[PDB]
Design a protein around this ligand. Structure first.
Ligand SMILES: CCCCCCCCCCCCCCCCCC(=O)OC[C@H](COP(=O)([O-])OCC(O)COP(=O)([O-])OC[C@@H](COC(=O)CCCCCCCCCCCCCCCCC)OC(=O)CCCCCCCCCCCCCCCCC)OC(=O)CCCCCCCCCCCCCCCCC
Ligand SMILES: CCCCCCCC/C=C\CCCCCCCC(=O)OC[C@H](COP(=O)(O)OCCN)OC(=O)CCCCCCC/C=C\CCCCCCCC
Ligand SMILES: CCCCCCCC/C=C\CCCCCCCC(=O)OC[C@H](COP(=O)(O)OCCN)OC(=O)CCCCCCC/C=C\CCCCCCCC
Ligand code: HEC
Ligand code: HEM
Ligand code: HEM
Ligand code: HEM
Ligand SMILES: CCCCCCCCCCCC(=O)OC[C@H](COP(=O)(O)OCC[N+](C)(C)C)OC(=O)CCCCCCCCCCC
Ligand SMILES: C/C=C(C)/C=C/C=C/[C@H](OC)[C@@H](C)[C@@H](OC)[C@@H](C)CCc1oc2c(O)c(OC)cc(OC)c2c(=O)c1C
Lengths: 67, 98, 49, 109, 379, 101, 241, 59, 79
């Protein structure tokens, strides 16, 4: 029924330069970790770099849409 | 007279009589699965009870016991090699070790 | 001798209304004093508040 | 310069100036002893007082009992409380006689 | 007779120390902290009494009583803020006061300086116990740590800790004795401050040039009474700005969590005014050394007077000393920074350096450069 | 050699007490030895030192300095007290050695 | 692990030194706390009377109050007993003690929100980012059973499940109950809850600055005035000839 | 000449000066307090319970 | 208690001053004031700034370095 401006903008933001490269960097990590069995690595770092860049963007206009 | 008055007054500072001296505490070694440590209130400051996997049990029995500040062997410290029990208080200045 | 002693010149500091050595400084006195005292009075009012 | 360090030192010059070289009438009687007792009472009260304040709890629900605990659990807490309670009285006993002396000998002048 | 300003047993004093008191004609702003410090003391005592009226020294009630003070007592929040922030401006001011003294060789007034050190030390202990009163996580663990410092003393030590706690662990007996101790000390400070000024008045204020000012003295009033009032108003703005606009800026948010005897927060840092010392103590990876270092980091102030080698009193005319000085100030600024950082690299080593640095600039460089400078003056 | 000799001139300008019109000796901290020296100073020298100082204090309160043209020049600095001070200290040392004797 | 994601900085309408709280949004946040959070979070330092004149009318507050049964007593026989709420009562504790609360939350203990924004670095910026920042663990990260992933929470494995989602309630003012909208209102509420003085605190600051300016000025003039006598003072050494 | 009149009638006599400060504060207070609040409330329109109020009030 | 009168022995120094009401409280704000503010600033900045500027860097380095050591080294899992 409704649309949380949070999602609407989170999408728009992921289009962004940094996100994209961060998102990509992440996918890469996820891929090799999700595959390579009996490993030792994690993709926290990439997820964070991504999140950090994304939400930073989100938090820049999200409120305009909120009441 | 002086020595006695000082004595008395000085000791009015020390621990009072309501400061008891309580007993034990039972703990089901099942609530503490392997690879985990758990804290329990006790005699004031914390109390640790940790279920050690043998992945650690080795390291703890395989270290220069001569290169220790307070030299002791992991063996003569505990009883069951899968369990380690100690009072969770840093011997430095008293904080709770994480 | 004390006859060779002069008070230096204080024009670099004198208030514009008492700069002319040939005008009774008295006429501008009430203002020179009224102004400074006003600052003070005001400060008092502020602190009082 | 000042020879002895009893009359020169910024602080001793004071203890000496009021409790050692202080000129005093040769004839003051026992009725002149309360000034210092009064002072000693003040000191004693403050002292025992701090000691008690260390175990008190300003709260309607705990005040009465904290005092009881002071007396019943704190080492010598009973003694300290007594000295503080009775000190108060000897403080008034002494102050009253101090006032008396003053009135009788015209110290109020 | 003639005037009742110079004859009256009491006024003779106010006039003797705040009106006709002769003062150098050239003392700068670095001389305004003496009174600000005094004003802080008064302000603290006053807001303190106000707060103590609504406090409850009991583990089970301390935290909430403070809350009630802020939430229910009219202007309770304001008073608590002024008290909390006043503590900081007390240290800000005391630190600058100490600086000025070192830079201008005021320490040559031994009794004034020594008592000054006692003041700093007392202010420290005072602020410590005081902070333990809201009984939040920081309060508890700070209490635990600081009092524990004394365990470092051979044989006795522990026995001293027992006293400090009134038990065998921090608990109510500790909280109540601390509230008493905190209520008391401020006054021992005010008292000692009287001795401070008394010794000071024996000699009178020193001045920037570090040379006799008898050829030019001026009545304290209206020159410095006026200067001081101005100074106060300047310090007042930031203090209030901070207090009214960013209340918890200088404070740890970890202390909004009631003391938990069983859990030391993962991130626990000393009040900013203690960081520098905290840092020095963490550097020595030994219990006793760290304590001794800590003790020394402050007690060393007593030596400063015996480390004066310059043939001149101030650093106004000693360019080398001036640099060594500002180096020291930054050295501390560094130690403070370090104190806020976790015990990890590169922080650890930097800290140890700064620490080693600190004691060296004070025990070795300064007296040395002073001697060197004397020779350069052909003395 | 003529090393510290120029070093000295450098320091003298670096110190800057001359921008106030003071001589090296004016800035001396008045400990016991110096106070004793100051006492022996002929009156003119003493009265002059006073004025120099009083003027410097006035400069300091003012937050000003003398015009570059009035600053004392390294080579025109008079060590009016230096010698007296030497003697004073010399005199004292003797008494001292003698009293331990 | 030894890595953590710090939250961003949202432009709260009350972030500014002269910026009051948006009472409308605070009213809203209340509802969120009342109808959603209160089920596990206690707000021990706030009472229904505190709402009056801030977010609710006296009547409204009294109403909200009575909706809760409170335990009082003892009575004549020394019995405890229930009774309606009074505006004097504080917000109801969901549990009689942490042990019970933990018991009802996987051993996890929901903290009391009274002073939450000030008990955590980041405040509403952190609380907000946490409430909305829920997501799946990155590669190589296994979230223990019971705990949920949240990159913003230290350790990333929190014990609280996403408390809010679109239309989890209905703002009686007609505001679109989107998840983030909710988080924004409850966070705004949690700020007021931690410091009601907030608004007055700032209004004072304003007056303070004004007076401080006017006064520091007048006193600078006064200090100077008196000192002029010395600043312009001229002297000369006229020895005898 | 205000400065002259002011001086002549208020600042000269130590008494009138004092009364003027009392009187002053009084007027200043009202003025300041009102204006200050005005400035605050303006910078925060529709956000204060003052503003919201009427929606849950009477009629 | 009283010190004004003993202080020191002074001879032949004349001074001239004016009532605060005959002069300006803050005069020659540009022709004199600021020029000296600069003078003073100028003469001390090279003594003060250095150690601070220095520490400043030490901050940035240590900060950045600590942070660098946070990031992961890909060479640890290229296996
Ligand atoms: C008011 C600021 C002064 C403005 C200025 O720079 O004066 C220059 C100038 C005066 O020039 P000047 O004659 O060479 O300076 C004489 C003194 O510096 C004139 O200054 P002063 O001696 O009369 O006053 C100095 C004053 C001014 O302090 C400052 O420099 C600022 O500092 C104090 O009084 C000490 C109090 C310090 C409070 C700090 C509290 C610590 C909290 C930290 C957070 O004034 C103007 O140009 C007009 C300004 C209006
Ligand atoms: C301890 C933990 C505290 C942490 C650090 C807090 C310090 C905050 C930053 C430093 C604040 C100082 C601001 C810089 C002022 C710059 C300035 O004006 O310096 C030049 C000026 C010129 O001097 P003159 O040669 O006499 O001038 C006459 C000729 N025209 O020098 C001065 O102002 C004198 C020195 C002022 C003291 C400031 C010291 C700051 C405080 C540090 C504490 C140090 C002491 C040791 C503490 C042990 C515990
Ligand atoms: C309703 C509104 C509130 C009502 C307030 C109550 C009214 C208070 C009446 C105060 C009466 C003031 C009368 C002063 C007269 C004394 C006098 O002789 O003059 C002032 C006299 C100097 O003499 P002159 O002005 O040079 O010349 C005299 C003129 N023939 O005293 C002064 O120097 C005045 C300076 C005042 C400012 C000093 C204080 C500033 C302090 C800063 C911090 C302030 C804020 C915090 C304060 C709260 C305290 C808990
Ligand atoms: C079903 C119970 C439940 C509800 C309802 C709930 N929470 Fe929680 N909350 C918890 C639990 C459990 C934790 C503890 C997590 C931990 O510390 O491991 C928690 C923790 C928190 C924390 C953060 C703890 C920390 O260390 O960062 C905040 C903030 C919080 N909740 C806010 C809210 C808010 C606001 C709401 C309403 C929008 C809400 N919660 C609703 C159960 C709940
Ligand atoms: C002027 C000196 C003092 C006088 C005259 C005095 C008098 C009293 C009196 C009469 C009581 C009630 C005694 C009772 O229980 O019967 C009392 C109690 C108490 N006083 Fe004082 N007191 C003095 C100083 C102090 C000081 C300085 C402190 C501590 C800072 C203190 C702390 C207390 C405490 C804790 C109690 C309450 C518990 C108790 O009754 O023992 N008193 N005091
Ligand atoms: C409650 C703490 C203190 C207060 C209120 C205080 C107050 C004062 C006051 C009023 C002055 C005179 C004005 C001034 O020169 O600033 C002064 C001077 C002085 N104080 Fe303190 N002081 C305190 C602590 C200390 C400390 C910690 C030291 C240093 C270890 C110290 C050392 C001195 C010295 C050396 C002087 C001489 C000033 C000069 O050079 O003329 N003071 N103090
Ligand atoms: C040397 C002056 C003083 C200093 C340095 C000082 C410092 C402090 C500090 C740092 C705290 C903790 C502040 C916080 O909550 O974050 C505190 C708390 C407190 N102080 Fe003081 N204080 C001073 C004087 C006093 C005095 C004389 C009293 C009253 C007799 C007092 C009463 C209190 C009370 C009731 C608290 C606990 C509640 C609270 O935190 O507000 N203080 N003080
Ligand atoms: C003048 C007279 C002073 C006599 C004191 C004395 O010397 O009297 C001796 C007593 C000490 O009693 P005890 O030896 O510990 O009893 C042993 C009991 N056991 C074995 C069970 C532990 O002192 C007091 O508490 C007197 C308090 C004086 C108050 C001081 C004013 C402040
Ligand atoms: C009953 C009264 C007693 C026992 C009085 C004791 C007085 C002792 C000293 O005053 C002279 C002391 C305050 C002073 O040392 C010189 C400080 C600079 C020490 C600073 C200090 O703070 C910490 C702190 O605040 C913490 O919590 C936020 C936690 C801490 O570590 C985990 C510390 C800490 O490790 C140190 C060294």
């Amino acid at each position: 029924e409704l649309v949380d401006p949070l999602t609407t903008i989170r999408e728009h933001c992921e289009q962004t330069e940094k996100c994209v490269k961060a998102r990509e960097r992440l996918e890469l990590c996820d891929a090799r970790v999700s595959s390579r069995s009996h490993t030792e690595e994690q993709c926290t770092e990439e997820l964070f770099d991504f999140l950090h860049a994304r939400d930073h963007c989100v938090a820049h206009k999200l409120f305009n849409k909120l009441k | 007279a002086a020595k006695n008055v000082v004595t008395q007054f000085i000791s009015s500072l020390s621990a009072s009589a309501d400061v008891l001296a309580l007993s034990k505490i039972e703990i089901k070694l099942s609530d503490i699965p392997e690879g985990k440590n758990v804290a329990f209130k006790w005699r004031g400051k914390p109390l640790f009870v940790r279920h050690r996997t043998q992945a650690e049990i080795n390291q703890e029995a395989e270290v220069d016991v001569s290169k220790l500040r307070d030299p002791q062997h992991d063996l003569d410290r505990v009883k069951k090699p899968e369990w380690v029990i100690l009072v969770g208080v840093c011997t430095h200045l008293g904080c709770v070790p994480i | 001798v004390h006859n060779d002693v002069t008070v230096p010149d204080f024009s670099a500091y004198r208030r514009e209304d008492v700069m002319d050595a040939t005008t009774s400084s008295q006429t501008s006195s009430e203002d020179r004093k009224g102004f400074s005292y006003l600052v003070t009075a005001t400060a008092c009012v502020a602190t009082a508040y | 310069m000042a020879p002895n360090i009893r009359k020169s030192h910024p602080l001793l010059k004071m203890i000496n100036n009021s409790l050692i070289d202080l000129p005093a009438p040769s004839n003051i009687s026992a009725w002149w002893n309360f000034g210092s007792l009064l002072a000693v009472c003040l000191m004693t009260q403050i002292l025992t007082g701090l000691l008690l304040a260390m175990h008190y709890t300003a709260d309607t629900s705990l005040a009465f009992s904290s005092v009881a605990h002071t007396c019943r659990n704190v080492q010598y807490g009973w003694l300290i409380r007594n000295l503080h309670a009775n000190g108060a009285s000897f403080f008034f006993i002494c102050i009253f006689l101090h006032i008396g002396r003053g009135l009788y000998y015209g110290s109020y002048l | 007779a003639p005037n009742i300003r110079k004859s009256h047993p009491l006024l003779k004093m106010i006039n003797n120390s705040l009106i006709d008191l002769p003062a150098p004609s050239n003392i700068s702003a670095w001389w305004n902290f003496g009174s600000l410090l005094a004003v802080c003391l008064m302000t603290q005592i006053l807001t303190g009494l106000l707060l103590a009226m609504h406090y409850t020294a009991d583990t089970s009630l301390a935290f909430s009583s403070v809350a009630h003070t802020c939430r229910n007592v009219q202007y309770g929040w304001l008073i608590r803020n002024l008290h909390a922030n006043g503590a900081s401006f007390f240290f800000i001011c005391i630190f600058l006061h100490i600086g000025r003294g070192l830079y201008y060789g005021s320490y040559l007034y031994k009794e004034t300086w020594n008592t000054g050190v006692i003041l700093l030390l007392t202010l420290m202990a005072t602020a410590f116990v005081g902070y333990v009163l809201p009984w939040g996580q920081m309060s508890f663990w700070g209490a635990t740590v600081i009092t524990n410092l004394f365990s470092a003393i051979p044989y006795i030590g522990h026995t001293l800790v027992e006293w400090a706690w009134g038990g065998f662990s921090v608990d109510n007996p500790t909280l109540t004795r601390f509230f008493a101790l905190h209520f008391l000390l401020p006054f021992a400070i005010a008292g000692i401050t009287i001795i401070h000024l008394t010794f000071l008045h024996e000699s009178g204020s020193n001045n920037p040039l570090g040379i006799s000012s008898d050829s030019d003295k001026i009545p304290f009033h209206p020159y410095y009474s006026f200067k001081d009032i101005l100074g106060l108003t300047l310090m007042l703005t930031p203090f209030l700005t901070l207090a009214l606009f960013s209340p918890n800026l200088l404070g740890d948010p970890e202390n909004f969590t009631p003391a938990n005897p069983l859990v030391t927060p993962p991130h626990i840092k000393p009040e900013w005014y203690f960081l520098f010392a905290y840092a020095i103590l963490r550097s020595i990876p030994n219990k006793l050394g760290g304590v001794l270092a800590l003790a020394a980091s402050v007690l060393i102030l007593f030596l400063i007077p015996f480390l004066h080698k310059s043939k001149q009193r101030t650093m106004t005319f000693r360019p080398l000393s001036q640099t060594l000085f500002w180096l020291l100030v930054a050295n501390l600024l560094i130690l403070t920074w370090i104190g806020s950082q976790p015990v990890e690299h590169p922080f650890i080593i930097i800290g140890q350096m700064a620490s080693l640095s600190y004691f060296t600039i004070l025990l070795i460089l300064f007296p040395t450069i002073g001697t060197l400078e004397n020779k350069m003056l052909n003395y | 050699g003529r090393l510290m000799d120029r070093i000295r001139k450098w320091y003298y300008n670096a110190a800057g007490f001359n921008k106030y019109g003071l001589m090296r000796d004016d800035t001396l901290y008045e400990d016991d030895d110096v106070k004793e020296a100051l006492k022996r100073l002929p009156e003119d020298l003493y009265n002059e030192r006073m004025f120099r100082i009083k003027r410097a204090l006035d400069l300091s309160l003012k937050h000003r300095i003398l015009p570059k043209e009035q600053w004392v020049k390294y080579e025109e600095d008079k060590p009016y007290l230096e010698p007296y001070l030497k003697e004073v200290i010399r005199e004292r040392l003797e008494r001292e050695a003698w009293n331990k004797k | 692990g030894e890595l953590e994601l710090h939250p961003p900085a949202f432009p709260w309408s009350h972030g500014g030194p002269l910026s009051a709280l948006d009472h409308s949004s605070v009213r809203r946040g209340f509802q969120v706390y009342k109808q959603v959070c209160s089920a596990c979070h206690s707000m021990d330092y706030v009472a229904f009377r505190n709402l009056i004149g801030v977010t609710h009318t006296e009547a409204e507050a009294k109403a909200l109050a009575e909706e809760v049964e409170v335990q009082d007593g003892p009575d004549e026989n020394g019995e405890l007993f229930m009774r309606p709420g009074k505006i004097s009562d504080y917000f109801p504790k969901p549990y009689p003690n942490p042990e019970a609360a933990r018991a009802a939350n996987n051993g996890a203990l929901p903290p009391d929100l009274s002073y939450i924004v000030n008990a955590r670095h980041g405040g509403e910026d952190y609380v907000f980012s946490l409430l909305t920042g829920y997501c799946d663990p990155p590669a190589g990260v296994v979230v223990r059973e019971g705990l949920h992933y949240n990159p913003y929470f230290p350790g990333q494995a929190i014990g609280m499940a996403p408390p809010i989602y679109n239309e989890i309630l209905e703002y009686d003012d007609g505001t679109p109950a989107t998840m983030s909208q909710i988080a924004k209102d409850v966070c705004t509420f949690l700020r007021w809850a931690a410091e009601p003085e907030h608004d007055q605190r700032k209004r004072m600051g304003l007056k303070m600055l004004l007076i401080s300016a006017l006064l520091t000025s007048l006193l600078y003039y006064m200090k100077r005035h008196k000192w002029s006598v010395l600043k312009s003072r001229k002297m000369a050494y006229r020895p005898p000839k | 000449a205000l400065l002259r009149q002011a001086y002549s009638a208020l600042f000269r006599r130590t008494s009138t000066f004092a009364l003027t400060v009392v009187l002053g504060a009084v007027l200043f207070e009202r003025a300041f307090d009102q204006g200050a609040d005005a400035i605050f409330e303006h910078l925060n329109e529709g956000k204060l319970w003052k503003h919201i109020k009427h929606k849950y009030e009477a009629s | 208690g009283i010190h004004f009168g003993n202080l020191a022995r002074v001879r032949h120094i004349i001074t001239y001053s004016l009532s605060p009401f005959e002069q300006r409280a803050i005069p020659n704000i540009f022709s004199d004031a600021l020029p000296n503010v600069w003078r003073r600033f100028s003469s001390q900045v090279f003594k003060v700034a250095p150690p601070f500027l220095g520490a400043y860097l030490l901050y940035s380095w240590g900060t950045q370095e600590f942070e660098r050591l946070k990031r992961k080294n890909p060479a640890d899992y290229e296996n």
